[PDB]
Design a protein around this motif. Structure first.
Motif, PDB file in Angstrom:
ATOM      1  N   UNK A 115       0.832  -1.192   0.000  1.00 47.44           N
ATOM      2  CA  UNK A 115       0.000   0.000   0.000  1.00 47.44           C
ATOM      3  C   UNK A 115       0.871   1.247   0.000  1.00 47.44           C
ATOM      4  N   UNK A 116       0.311   2.355  -0.479  1.00 48.29           N
ATOM      5  CA  UNK A 116       1.041   3.614  -0.551  1.00 48.29           C
ATOM      6  C   UNK A 116       1.548   4.071   0.816  1.00 48.29           C
ATOM      7  N   UNK A 117       0.824   3.723   1.873  1.00 47.53           N
ATOM      8  CA  UNK A 117       1.248   4.095   3.220  1.00 47.53           C
ATOM      9  C   UNK A 117       2.385   3.215   3.762  1.00 47.53           C
ATOM     10  N   UNK A 118       2.648   2.067   3.142  1.00 46.85           N
ATOM     11  CA  UNK A 118       3.703   1.181   3.637  1.00 46.85           C
ATOM     12  C   UNK A 118       5.110   1.717   3.415  1.00 46.85           C
ATOM     13  N   UNK A 119       6.038   1.261   4.248  1.00 47.46           N
ATOM     14  CA  UNK A 119       7.430   1.661   4.131  1.00 47.46           C
ATOM     15  C   UNK A 119       7.978   1.107   2.822  1.00 47.46           C
ATOM     16  N   UNK A 120       8.867   1.858   2.177  1.00 45.02           N
ATOM     17  CA  UNK A 120       9.468   1.417   0.921  1.00 45.02           C
ATOM     18  C   UNK A 120      10.306   0.152   1.133  1.00 45.02           C
ATOM     19  N   UNK A 121      10.717  -0.086   2.377  1.00 39.94           N
ATOM     20  CA  UNK A 121      11.519  -1.264   2.719  1.00 39.94           C
ATOM     21  C   UNK A 121      10.734  -2.576   2.622  1.00 39.94           C
ATOM     22  N   UNK A 122       9.412  -2.486   2.504  1.00 39.70           N
ATOM     23  CA  UNK A 122       8.570  -3.670   2.324  1.00 39.70           C
ATOM     24  C   UNK A 122       8.903  -4.384   0.979  1.00 39.70           C
ATOM     25  N   UNK A 123       9.585  -3.692   0.061  1.00 40.15           N
ATOM     26  CA  UNK A 123       9.997  -4.278  -1.225  1.00 40.15           C
ATOM     27  C   UNK A 123      11.157  -5.279  -1.102  1.00 40.15           C
ATOM     28  N   UNK A 124      12.014  -5.093  -0.097  1.00 39.47           N
ATOM     29  CA  UNK A 124      13.186  -5.934   0.099  1.00 39.47           C
ATOM     30  C   UNK A 124      12.845  -7.321   0.559  1.00 39.47           C
ATOM     31  N   UNK A 125      13.486  -8.304  -0.049  1.00 38.02           N
ATOM     32  CA  UNK A 125      13.223  -9.687   0.325  1.00 38.02           C
ATOM     33  C   UNK A 125      13.554  -9.963   1.793  1.00 38.02           C
ATOM     34  N   UNK A 127      12.266  -8.892   4.377  1.00 45.03           N
ATOM     35  CA  UNK A 127      11.931  -7.834   5.320  1.00 45.03           C
ATOM     36  C   UNK A 127      10.525  -8.035   5.866  1.00 45.03           C
ATOM     37  N   UNK A 128      10.428  -8.188   7.177  1.00 46.53           N
ATOM     38  CA  UNK A 128       9.139  -8.382   7.816  1.00 46.53           C
ATOM     39  C   UNK A 128       8.727  -7.088   8.480  1.00 46.53           C
ATOM     40  N   UNK A 129       7.573  -7.133   9.113  1.00 47.00           N
ATOM     41  CA  UNK A 129       7.086  -5.972   9.811  1.00 47.00           C
ATOM     42  C   UNK A 129       8.067  -5.511  10.894  1.00 47.00           C
ATOM     43  N   UNK A 130       8.673  -6.448  11.613  1.00 48.70           N
ATOM     44  CA  UNK A 130       9.607  -6.053  12.656  1.00 48.70           C
ATOM     45  C   UNK A 130      10.818  -5.360  12.020  1.00 48.70           C
ATOM     46  N   UNK A 131      11.238  -5.813  10.838  1.00 45.63           N
ATOM     47  CA  UNK A 131      12.387  -5.188  10.165  1.00 45.63           C
ATOM     48  C   UNK A 131      12.034  -3.754   9.924  1.00 45.63           C
ATOM     49  N   UNK A 132      10.851  -3.609   9.383  1.00 48.43           N
ATOM     50  CA  UNK A 132      10.430  -2.286   9.080  1.00 48.43           C
ATOM     51  C   UNK A 132      10.287  -1.446  10.341  1.00 48.43           C
ATOM     52  N   UNK A 133       9.770  -2.021  11.421  1.00 51.84           N
ATOM     53  CA  UNK A 133       9.593  -1.230  12.628  1.00 51.84           C
ATOM     54  C   UNK A 133      10.940  -0.765  13.146  1.00 51.84           C
ATOM     55  N   UNK A 134      11.916  -1.662  13.144  1.00 50.64           N
ATOM     56  CA  UNK A 134      13.244  -1.331  13.631  1.00 50.64           C
ATOM     57  C   UNK A 134      13.967  -0.340  12.731  1.00 50.64           C
ATOM     58  N   UNK A 135      13.731  -0.430  11.430  1.00 54.55           N
ATOM     59  CA  UNK A 135      14.367   0.511  10.525  1.00 54.55           C
ATOM     60  C   UNK A 135      13.775   1.895  10.786  1.00 54.55           C
ATOM     61  N   UNK A 136      12.447   1.973  10.825  1.00 50.87           N
ATOM     62  CA  UNK A 136      11.750   3.234  11.082  1.00 50.87           C
ATOM     63  C   UNK A 136      12.162   3.821  12.427  1.00 50.87           C
ATOM     64  N   UNK A 137      12.297   2.963  13.432  1.00 53.77           N
ATOM     65  CA  UNK A 137      12.704   3.416  14.749  1.00 53.77           C
ATOM     66  C   UNK A 137      14.062   4.069  14.656  1.00 53.77           C
ATOM     67  N   UNK A 138      14.851   3.634  13.695  1.00 55.54           N
ATOM     68  CA  UNK A 138      16.205   4.116  13.565  1.00 55.54           C
ATOM     69  C   UNK A 138      16.344   5.266  12.586  1.00 55.54           C
ATOM     70  N   UNK A 139      15.241   5.656  11.963  1.00 53.94           N
ATOM     71  CA  UNK A 139      15.336   6.681  10.941  1.00 53.94           C
ATOM     72  C   UNK A 139      15.854   6.158   9.592  1.00 53.94           C
ATOM     73  N   UNK A 140      15.788   4.845   9.374  1.00 57.04           N
ATOM     74  CA  UNK A 140      16.190   4.262   8.097  1.00 57.04           C
ATOM     75  C   UNK A 140      14.868   4.065   7.344  1.00 57.04           C
ATOM     76  N   UNK A 141      14.726   4.757   6.214  1.00 60.94           N
ATOM     77  CA  UNK A 141      13.477   4.720   5.462  1.00 60.94           C
ATOM     78  C   UNK A 141      13.600   4.411   3.977  1.00 60.94           C
ATOM     79  N   UNK A 142      14.804   4.532   3.436  1.00 55.82           N
ATOM     80  CA  UNK A 142      15.006   4.264   2.032  1.00 55.82           C
ATOM     81  C   UNK A 142      15.949   3.113   1.785  1.00 55.82           C
TER      82      UNK A 142
END
Length: 290
Positions: A115-125, A127-142
């Motif tokens: 979805x458009x609201x999802x993190x762009x990191x959802x494209x990476x093989x 990568x689960x929701x926790x990956x994304x949560x931890x990346x976002x927590x860290x300011x890693x978004x691209x």
């Protein structure tokens, strides 16, 4: 025009007039209808277009489906891109900027299953929701933020095996990292009613050129792009061109110059396959004449 409306335009297509309607699926569909992000109203679980709308949302949300429903989804998906492109054609031809840009993003969404609201990191093989949560927590978004990390940081954060990382590396090396440069031709000689020509040049900086990596999209896809000029303030789409890019490409857009005086526009570069790769540049022109 919201994403919901765009999905409805795609699922209401005559092309889906014959999507399989099965005995004994209403159950899954009724529940599916309860879970998808955009709940449907009168749901008629006998309408191929209703089924198509739910299966499209399920795809975007990457939900669990029956083998049969998964097969139906694959059928829908095989006709989706062409329909979305036609939708972009219609919205842009009519001059509707926001709706046209949203439709372009929908092509990316369907391709990457997100979805458009999802993190762009959802494209990476892997990568689960926790990956994304931890990346976002860290300011890693691209994806670029991911690539800039050294091994120690990456291993601590992603906790992936060497084999999983190799898959991630493969995606990152093909992820669009394009340098876009542009020139307003003869910026000092633009006359009202005359042509405003914008020469755009694109250059791929990433390592690999090739088909789109999209594990959840059945068919082989080629990377497609749109270059657009519009007035964000008035929501007007002025010029648009579709293109495919190898290493380097030149794209020329033009439009009629408005009344004499200063004007502002936005140059957009939009993917139809990946998310997080779009670019926007607000430029200005001084129209002489009069």
């Amino acid at each position: 025009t919201k994403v919901r409306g765009l999905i409805e335009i795609i699922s209401n297509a005559a092309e889906y007039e014959n999507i399989p309607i099965r005995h004994h699926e209403d159950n899954l569909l009724r529940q599916l209808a309860q879970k998808v992000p955009h709940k449907l109203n009168n749901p008629k679980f006998n309408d191929p277009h209703v089924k198509t709308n739910l299966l499209l949302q399920a795809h975007l949300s990457r939900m669990q489906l029956s083998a049969e429903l998964q097969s139906d989804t694959e059928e829908i998906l095989s006709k989706a891109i062409r329909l979305i492109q036609a939708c972009v054609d219609v919205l842009s031809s009519n001059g509707w900027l926001s709706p046209a840009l949203a439709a372009m993003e929908l092509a990316q969404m369907v391709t990457q299953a997100m979805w458009s609201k999802d993190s762009y990191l959802k494209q990476l093989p892997h990568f689960t929701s926790e990956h994304i949560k931890r990346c976002t927590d860290k300011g890693v978004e691209s994806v670029f933020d991911i690539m800039e990390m050294e091994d120690e940081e990456r291993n601590a954060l992603l906790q992936l095996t060497d084999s999983q990382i190799a898959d991630v590396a493969r995606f990152c090396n093909r992820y669009p990292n394009i340098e876009l440069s542009y020139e307003v031709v003869d910026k000092d000689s633009i006359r009202s009613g005359g042509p405003v020509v914008v020469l755009v040049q694109l250059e791929r900086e990433e390592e690999v050129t090739g088909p789109v990596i999209a594990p959840l999209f059945p068919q082989k896809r080629e990377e497609g792009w749109w270059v657009v000029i519009g007035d964000a303030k008035s929501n007007s789409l002025i010029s648009i061109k579709r293109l495919t890019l190898q290493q380097k490409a030149k794209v020329k857009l033009d439009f009629v110059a408005p009344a004499t005086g200063a004007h502002n526009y936005t140059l957009y570069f939009m993917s139809d396959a990946y998310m997080g790769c779009d670019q926007e540049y607000k430029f200005s022109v001084d129209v002489k004449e009069a």
